[PDB]
């Protein structure tokens, strides 16, 4: 019965995880956009001291997101979130049952966290070589049931963790988004239709099928105007190696 | 009834959370010391095809660690152990109940993984300045209950993520091991006895006291040792300015 308010922006793929995860629980739950890149409200270190999107609150009064209660709990960390929401509507089994189940989803997002989010940030963000992310990404793609399926078999959270950083890796590649070489560019492009790469292509075709997707995806060109704003992804700069 | 078997080596932070929490939980397992650093075993990708400490196996037949069954689950990344053996062991109380503790647990976890344990890198394998280091600290001490207590209140696996980092720390610095300056580990120091930095160490040291750190410590003097044989700590170098 307690409310939830999720503070989000359009690009935020840790945004988007959280998203997700609400839209699988059923839950009711407020979305409240925060330009947190250009202009943050002077009351959103309220709800995140950490100043970052996406921020939580929980409980407390109900009242405007704009106007957070003291008395709400401020949950930060978006994987934190995801289990928050697993805790708290059990009948969605938003995570397995069986225990070595759980540690696949667990292992999961901590292959994605620890090999793969690095990799995304520096090839994008800096233009690092992306021959390490493509590494990165076969690992993780092995780690996926090979006949099918979500990464603990059902889907659970896990999913909800790392849809939002692929998802957005084809179209933002399609678009030249990002600081790394035209030559990198191609590589990635051709890698990721290549054979090698079919297992992780039906996991984001399986994900994104879902209406937890639809209902939380802009669309391909929209994602990609929003990913515009940000500041760290400047137009006409490239790094080579 | 499931065997439990832990591939360890006393130098590594990562392994000791994992020992910590089977402690707690009072499981029965074994441990298996492999030289990872230097002398892999050619079966060890068996266990982890990553090549990293900790590995785990789970169930199966009972077999020599050196020879482990195809049969068990593999088990990889810490903390997807540590929520593994919370979830094995939920008679021992490894997380709280309640959904927003638990919550609290999870968001220490993630701030130490996403803030903290990046500078710790930086500072003691590139001997990158510590000022930030000692911010994202006392941005972790600021997540504790200011009055007392662990993570969420009472123990949890939050606390056995973070202790066996905060714990060389201090014993690291004053061995002088790490890239850091001669100049930042004295800065370092200071700062880790001054009252900035009460709160942090009232936590080390309620975590040192409980047995399940000194069942998995050498004591500070051997795991100094242990440590100097860890080539990314350069034993007798260091960068300056
Ligand atoms: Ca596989």
């Given at each position: 019965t307690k409310q939830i308010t999720l503070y989000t922006a359009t690009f935020s793929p840790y945004a988007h995880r959280v998203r997700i995860a609400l839209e699988e629980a059923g839950a009711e739950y407020t979305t409240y956009d925060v330009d947190i890149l250009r202009n943050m409200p002077d009351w959103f270190p309220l709800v995140n001291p950490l100043k970052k999107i996406p921020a939580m609150t929980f409980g407390?009064?109900?009242?405007?997101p704009d106007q957070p209660s003291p008395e709400s709990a401020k949950i930060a960390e978006s994987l934190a979130m995801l289990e928050f929401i697993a805790d708290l509507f059990?009948?969605?089994?938003?995570?397995?049952?069986?225990p070595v189940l759980r540690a696949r989803a667990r292992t999961f997002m901590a292959l994605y966290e620890n090999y793969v989010n690095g990799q995304f940030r520096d090839v994008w963000?800096?233009?690092?070589?992306?021959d390490p992310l493509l590494q990165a990404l076969e690992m993780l793609q092995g780690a996926?049931?090979?006949?099918?399926?979500?990464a603990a078999g059902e889907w659970s959270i896990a999913d909800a963790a790392v849809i939002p950083f692929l998802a957005r890796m084809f179209p933002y590649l399609e678009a030249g988004?990002?600081?790394?070489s035209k030559e990198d560019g191609v590589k990635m492009r051709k890698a990721m239709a290549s054979e090698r790469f079919a297992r992780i292509r039906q996991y984001v075709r399986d994900c994104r099928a879902r209406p937890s997707f639809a209902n939380t995806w802009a669309g391909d060109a929209e994602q990609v105007e929003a990913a515009k704003?940000?500041?760290?992804?400047?137009?006409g700069e490239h790094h080579h190696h």
């Open positions: 407390g009064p109900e009242v405007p059990p009948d969605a089994k938003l995570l397995p049952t069986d963000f800096l233009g690092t070589p992306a996926l049931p090979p006949d099918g399926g979500f988004l990002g600081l790394y704003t940000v500041p760290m992804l400047r137009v």
